[PDB]
Amino acid sequence: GRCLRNHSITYKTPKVPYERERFDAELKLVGQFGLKNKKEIQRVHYMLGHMRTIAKVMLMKDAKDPKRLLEGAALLRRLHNLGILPRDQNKLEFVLALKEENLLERRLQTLVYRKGFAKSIHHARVLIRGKMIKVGKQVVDVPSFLVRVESEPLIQLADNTP
Amino acid sequence: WTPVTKLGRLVKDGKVKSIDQIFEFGIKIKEYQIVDHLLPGLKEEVMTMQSVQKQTSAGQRTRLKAYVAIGDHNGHAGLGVKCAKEVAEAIKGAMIQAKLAMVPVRRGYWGATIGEVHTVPCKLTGACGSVRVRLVPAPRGTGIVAAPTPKKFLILAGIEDVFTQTTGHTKTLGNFVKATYDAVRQSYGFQTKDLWKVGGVKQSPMDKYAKILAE
Amino acid sequence: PLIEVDLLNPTAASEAKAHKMKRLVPTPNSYFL
Amino acid sequence: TNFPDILKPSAEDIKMMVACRVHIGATNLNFAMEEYVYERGNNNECIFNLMKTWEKLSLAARVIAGISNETPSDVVAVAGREMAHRASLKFMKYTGCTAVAGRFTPGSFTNQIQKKFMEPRLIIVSDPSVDHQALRESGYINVPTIAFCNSDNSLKNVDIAIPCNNRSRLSIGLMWWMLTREILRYQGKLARDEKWDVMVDLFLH
Amino acid sequence: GRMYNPGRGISRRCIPYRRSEDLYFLMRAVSVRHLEKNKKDKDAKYHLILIESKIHRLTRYYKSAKVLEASFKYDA
Amino acid sequence: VRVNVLADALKSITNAEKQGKRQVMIRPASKVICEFLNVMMKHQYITDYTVVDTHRSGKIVVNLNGRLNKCAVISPRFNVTLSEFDKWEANLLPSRHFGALVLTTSYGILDNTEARAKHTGGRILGFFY
Amino acid sequence: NKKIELYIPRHCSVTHTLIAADDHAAVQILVPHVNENGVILPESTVYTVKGSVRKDGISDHSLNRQFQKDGFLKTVVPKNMMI
RNA sequence: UUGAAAAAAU
RNA sequence: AUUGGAGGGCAAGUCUGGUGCCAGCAGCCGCGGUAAUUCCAGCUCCAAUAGUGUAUAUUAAAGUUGCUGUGAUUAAAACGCUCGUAGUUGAAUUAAUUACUUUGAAUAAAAUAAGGUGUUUAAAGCAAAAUGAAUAUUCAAGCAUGGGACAAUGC
RNA sequence: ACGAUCAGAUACCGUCGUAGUCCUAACUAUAAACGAUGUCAACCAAGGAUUGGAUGAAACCUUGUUCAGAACUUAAAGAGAAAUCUUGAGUUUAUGGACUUCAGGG
């Protein structure tokens, strides 16, 4: 090793570089959210696969397993307040059933769309990047902000940002 | 229209409502119009176009061989092959064979019965020629981990999660789909633990309704 | 063979034809005169 | 029960069965026909059990009657030997069952496009050794078969086998006569309390 | 099968279901070692090795069983 | 020679079932063979069996009922830790709801399901679908 | 809503094994119950035989082990041949 | 009885 | 905002000028001898994007190094045959160690998986608005202990 | 070494003929040394016949049972790329009976 500070990757390119079925199925999602490139498709995919691993690994063990009680509940607990999983779904099996549209729907470009500020999802990029949007008490210029459940009634416009 | 077989008349006259009832008693579908009645809106796909040749005294008698796989995503799929001079006819000729060769696709669970079927019930292997395809159940999240050739067939059968291992000359596309179809074809032939009980007794559709077709 | 019979209870003739070591309970074919 | 005392073979019925040497089978004995053979003749020929022959014949006729009493045409009888045709056609007339006299055209049960395409639900063959083609067709249509099998004929694709001499001339007419009478007897069209008006010689070659 | 030849003989004595030295006999090796007069008999020179291999296998076992003294050794 | 008596018995049973036989014979009756059948009997994969005494490790007659798809012995019995169970289930069994392993432990010849509750490991003997 | 098993497969009475959906050699024999007067009745017993068993010369002998046991036959099969 | 050979890519 | 490409692998042109088996392209099959979908170029769009090709090398592909897991009649591959030491494997049976198996003890951190925490998100950091994860270990050995079915050691 | 045949023939065809072909002693250790199929063990469809014993009938021959050996025929079954194999080349992605040798594109 060289450096004491840690680093990590967020997106991995697909194994097959060319598929006619994997471009429309991406533009149908890229055009739905008005993203910039194809990284966020993989970045959301990488995040979903990350949490899918723990649930799949934990599901193999019995209910009385101590790690299932501790790590399994802590996985749902984080998944609950993040807004990915509705509160009424409280089983480890529902984590695998989650798709990539759930995490994409919690992006700030999608939350401000449903609040009534940007008519088009492409127009919301300027508002978030221009610092017109404040989440409670802090200005935000990162469109990929995944809000929590408590902050859903808390996104609103700022007050004459510089 | 105008069936010429005993089972065909029952389908036309609205006596058999479900295709699975035919699979129960081993009745062989001999008219492709039967499937077009009980299974409307069947998804369509052409696997490949392969040209074969025969050397003659004057030249080569080239013919086009078409593999098409059809089925509904609810647990039915088929596969048929036809060779003909015309490209359009080869697809049409394989259309009938695909309908003629329907088979149930048994699906099951992996972890628990929390809703709907997603994977195969148990491990299966397709006994094609050199190509052998093995089907392994997978958890809910995992998609169809397979080559582009059998994955497109597994989509039409309704299976959404599966693990596949392959062995042989998989670059032969004709044997690849044949192996995939063969593995699924014997899904209902493996006596698992949940099929021990005999169950109820049901009369055959061709015996309850035998008198209506006797006149 | 192919026509399965009762292995537990063979007929008297069935055990009178087979090899002595191949009977259900092997017994000698010799006596003491 | 399922086999009441009424269907016991009358001594008159046995009297004619031994008259035609029905019990006398071929020399070579198949492995599947050891049970039906009581012992061997002086010149090493199988002698069928007369009691077992009647018991199999009655069971064979019971299945045909239960299936030909609402759809008589669904039973198809084929005749292989050049002489066993007359008994087959007499069986066709007196029961309404469809019959094939001479050579069996291959693909008749499978080629639906063929004009002469029958789809029976029960096939009766007079000789499995000569009617192998008809028996082999049942493997593609899920149709059970009944055979007048002999001591050496291979019992492949047969479901009900009647141990009887199928190479002589009197026995061929007799067994089909016996089977025809029982089929009517089970149906109630001719009770056992009387004697059949037709005679055995009407079925002969 | 047999120890050396590929024969499979199954003839066995059959003790009923009711309850109411070889090393010396194998030295056969002496009788063959006849080889003095028939020197070209390569067949006997092969079976003699087979016989002597048997003796060295029984002696290898009778020593462990403590039936023969550990200084035992067969020779001509 | 007869290295493994259990291997001979299990292959005889699998061959008989595929041919559709009703009963099979096993010549050498060992305590491993007898208690192996009990694990299959407790799961109703066979009806019953009968040990016949012949004073020479007598024969065994087993009655089968159309259920044993395949029973196979395993090359020398690997030491299996309770954490190593999941590796063997994912390899030797078709599905998590169908198959069953057989392990010889200090608490007798158990299966994979009843050893997990018993909380013990042991050498793997075989499996039966 | 939907049912997880598309259909309940049959069971061959000879080997007590599942019947394949594409097994075209498997037959179904129906033998009818007879009354005291020796005249058949609508009630009958459904017998199924797997195709593989048929092609060996075994379907005939195996049914006699089922016919005699069920009472439809008396003395075709001896005692030691019954299991 | 004798019968050797037919330049390269299309 | 560039690179590579627009015959197949593999997404993208049945467009136009010359060259005429020559220049050349081409990772493999291949395109070029006068009407080139591949050459040198003109227009257009396909993949990625502050990234993008090449050359070399580790890994997966590779069930083409096999414990899981290969092949040996004919594709490569059973010694000409037998004896034989080391090595490996060894029938049923019984109502002092070792191995196996289960728990612990103790075992540097960093790193892997993570428990929490709006560095505004994220990489990060253990910080802040008292907490330090029990943090799970640790292959192979060593100590203690519950069990003796399968195993080896001679009585 | 001759005589033919041939464009040539130093070969096939004909005649003659040294080593060799045979035995003894000592070397040599290779063959398409092949069943191109290692050795030991368990299971395994149907049939005729054969070599050598044993056991009943029949007064070397015919016939029943059984053991060991060289083999043969049928299969809608099993395996395989197929040819074919079945006293295995079957019991194998449903992959593990024991051991040894050998192979890694040309």
From Swiss-Prot, chain A:
Kindly indicate whether the keyword Cell membrane belongs to this entry.
no
The GO molecular function terms of this record are: rRNA binding; structural constituent of ribosome
Q: What's a GO biological-process term for it?
A: ribosomal small subunit biogenesis
Where does the S4 RNA-binding domain start and stop, copy by copy? 106-162
Name a GO CC annotation attached to this entry. cytosolic small ribosomal subunit
Keyword Signal attached: no
Which family is this sequence assigned to? Belongs to the universal ribosomal protein uS4 family.
Protein name, as recorded: Small ribosomal subunit protein uS4
Curated annotation (Swiss-Prot), chain C:
Q: Supply the alphabetized keyword list.
A: Cytoplasm, Metal-binding, Ribonucleoprotein, Ribosomal protein, Zinc, Zinc-finger
The biological process GO terms on file are: ribosomal small subunit assembly; translation
Origin: domain of life: Eukaryota
A cellular component term (GO) from this record?
cytosolic small ribosomal subunit
Q: Name one GO molecular function term.
A: zinc ion binding
The record's subcellular locations are: Cytoplasm
Q: What is its main location?
A: cytoplasm
Please describe what this protein does.
Answer: Component of the small ribosomal subunit. The ribosome is a large ribonucleoprotein complex responsible for the synthesis of proteins in the cell. Required for proper rRNA processing and maturation of 18S rRNAs.
Instruction: Report the sequence similarity comment from the record.
Output: Belongs to the eukaryotic ribosomal protein eS27 family.
SUBUNIT field: Component of the small ribosomal subunit.
Name of the molecule in the record: Small ribosomal subunit protein eS27
**Protein source organism:** Entamoeba histolytica (strain ATCC 30459 / HM-1:IMSS / ABRM)
Q: What is the lineage of its organism?
A: Eukaryota, Amoebozoa, Evosea, Archamoebae, Mastigamoebida
What range of the full-length protein does this chain span? Answer: 2 to 34 of 84
